């Protein structure tokens with residue numbers, strides 16, 4: 266570690282701790298910058314040389330974390346918990362937590378190598394037909410979205426899960442052991458306990474379960490309605506009206522968003538088509554247009570435009586040359602107050618327009634808290650960061666807003682159109698909830714040891730069936746590692762943030778709509794051009810993590826806790842309508858035939 270990045274001396278009291286924290290944050294910026302820069306260089310250009318460079322950067326970050334962490338423990342370990350300043354307790358409390366820097370050098374290198382190899386495997390995995398091979402994005406993504414052939418969807422689904430999952434399993438087992446070893450030295454029972462601690466709620470898991478109980482009936486009714494719609498097209502052989510839905514038929518590789526099957530489930534087709542994708546294609550929208558349109562919404566609220574450095578630095582399409590990249594969308598803060606970038610393999614699609622807003626929400630957060638000390642440059646909690654762009658996309662997707670940006674003919678304000686819209690939104694928001702909840706339940710079980718390598722897939726599919734009411738379309742066994750075929754698993758990034766964000770975004774939307782002076786139904790609100798809504802949002806963004814999330818939320822929303830009521834209020838009309846329809850159709854809610862799996866196609870797997 267460079268002499269300039271090593272800690273000096275400070276007194277072993279609160280006053281010295283304040284000076285320690287100030288000096289720590291000054292040095293940390295340079296270390297963060299080199300770390301991010303090397304990660305950017307690899308993720309936008311996957312090579313062996315770029316991977317080695319990223320691994321060296323990770324080692325340097327560990328050296329830094331070790332030096333300052335040991336210093337913090339030397340001076341403050343027995344006293345930091347009694348410090349009067351709560352912001353100071355949070356920062357020193359973080360610095361005393363070494364993580365992977367707790368590992369001996371050999372194991373540090375092993376840990377970094379594993380992360381690199383898992384990332385490489387996930388992003389370079391392909392499905393081969395003789396010589397031509399399909400990638401996840403765009404090839405397999407397009408197939409799951411637009412193919413309605415049971416056999417083709419199966420080939421894509423099985424191909425991907427096999428190609429990504431199988432080689433990942435041995436690496437994931439080793440990562441889990443090393444990660445646990447690291448965090449146990451910091452006093453956590455396991456890595457899952459550390460991840461959960463970010464929410465600073467002693468009742469976090471029970472709070473989540475209470476939230477889910479209120480939401481589950483909405484999912485069960487959506488599920489039943491959708492299952493019936495699928496049965497009408499795939500037939501009694503491939504769809505069991507009392508069983509789980511085959512996992513490959515919902516428009517998405519992980520069945521986590523069902524928006525792609527909207528045309529099959531739309532109750533009133535004679536009304537204007539709310540899926541704006543075909544209109545975007547006809548008009549000739551490109552990635553550039555999508556990002557500029559997203560930017561203009563942010564500026565309409567008097568938030569910050571994207572800086573020159575963003576436009577010059579970002580990767581907004583999958584590169585046309587012979588470059589392999591990480592295609593999963595991401596937003597990047599370089600911690601230099603100047604460089605902020607998005608890397609997205611943008612496709613011309615309505616849901617991708619929502620994803621553009623999502624990523625720009627992360628950037629906007631970075632732009633707003635860039636002048637804070639580096640440790641405060643995060644969301645109030647991870648759920649906040651994930652909610653920002655989604656809140657704005659709720660306004661963008663309204664038929665009225667779509668009309669304003671030229672993507673829809675003036676829509677009527679009638680009950681049929683409302684049901685169509687809310688159903689579309691339910692496919693995107695309600696359908697996701699069970700998946701958002703289950704992923705880290707699986708992962709927490711793995712970190713805790715409740716789920717050993719011998720039950721990885723057994724426990725994955727237990728949760729997928731329990732929550733989502735889906736089943737694998739082909740037989741799986743413990744050689745398969747289907748959890749690993751989801752980006753966030755091999756990329757070691759937590760998932761509960763997304764469940765939190767999907768609830769939180771409706772709380773934000775309600776608060777911002779009220780501030781904007783809007784007086785109608787919540788699902789018809791559009792905050793576009795509301796400088797008052799803008800100012801309220803900006804206060805949250807400029808706060809960073811300087812204050813407990815409960816207090817930030819109280820100031821914005823009037824409540825100091827996550828609450829499902831705004832989501833329920835938003836969806837109320839379609840919730841009632843789906844209940845009524847399922848009752849009339851004589852549906853069974855749930856999947857009592859839990860053991861049911863669909864048969865294989867006759868000519869499996871050829872075609």
Ligand SMILES: *[C@@H]1O[C@H](CO[C@@H]2O[C@@H](C)[C@@H](O)[C@@H](O)[C@@H]2O)[C@@H](O[C@@H]2O[C@H](CO)[C@@H](O[C@@H]3O[C@H](CO)[C@@H](O)[C@H](O)[C@@H]3O)[C@H](O)[C@H]2NC(C)=O)[C@H](O)[C@H]1NC(C)=O
Nearest residue numbers: 663664665677678679782783784785786787788789790791
């Ligand atoms: C779509 O239409 C709804 C409903 O419109 C109402 O019902 C129809 C069947 C017709 O009778 C319409 O003539 C009638 O307006 C609209 O929602 C309604 O918006 C109005 C105006 O924003 C709301 O009135 C306000 O109510 C608050 C208290 O809640 C008062 O403080 C205000 O002074 C003001 O009177 C009204 O509450 C609301 N109605 C319902 C049932 O929610 C909606 O505006 C419209 N949407 C679009 C995009 O055009």
Ligand SMILES: CC(=O)N[C@@H](CC(=O)O)C(=O)N[C@@H](Cc1ccccc1)P(=O)(O)C[C@@H](C)C(=O)N[C@@H](C)C(N)=O
Nearest residue numbers: 593594595596597598620623624627650651756758763
């Ligand atoms: C970790 C980081 O540098 N930026 C985060 C945003 C932030 O916390 O500042 C990010 O880009 N995070 C992205 C996911 C990611 C996480 C870690 C590495 C690479 C990608 P995202 O949440 O914006 C991508 C988003 C499309 C996503 O994954 N959504 C969920 C619902 C999903 N499964 O599709």
Ligand SMILES: *[C@@H]1O[C@H](CO)[C@@H](O[C@@H]2O[C@H](CO)[C@@H](O)[C@H](O)[C@H]2NC(C)=O)[C@H](O)[C@H]1NC(C)=O
Nearest residue numbers: 306309310311312313314315316584586587588
């Ligand atoms: C992808 O990364 C490689 C390095 O892994 C880059 O190749 C280097 O390019 C610079 C300048 O063009 C040369 O000085 C090096 O000799 C190259 N290294 C190797 C190992 O070939 C490459 O430029 C990157 N690709 C893109 C499009 O940025």
Ligand SMILES: *[C@@H]1O[C@H](CO[C@@H]2O[C@@H](C)[C@@H](O)[C@@H](O)[C@@H]2O)[C@@H](O)[C@H](O)[C@H]1NC(C)=O
Nearest residue numbers: 427738739740741742743744745865869870
């Ligand atoms: C796990 O399953 C692997 C491949 O899947 C199997 O083969 C196909 C063609 C079908 O018959 C399907 O029903 C089977 O699941 C096997 O190669 C492998 O032996 C299995 N792993 C273990 C440990 O038994």
Ligand SMILES: [Cl-]
Nearest residue numbers: 647759761762
């Ligand atoms: Cl999280």
Ligand SMILES: [Zn+2]
Nearest residue numbers: 623627650651
């Ligand atoms: Zn995100």
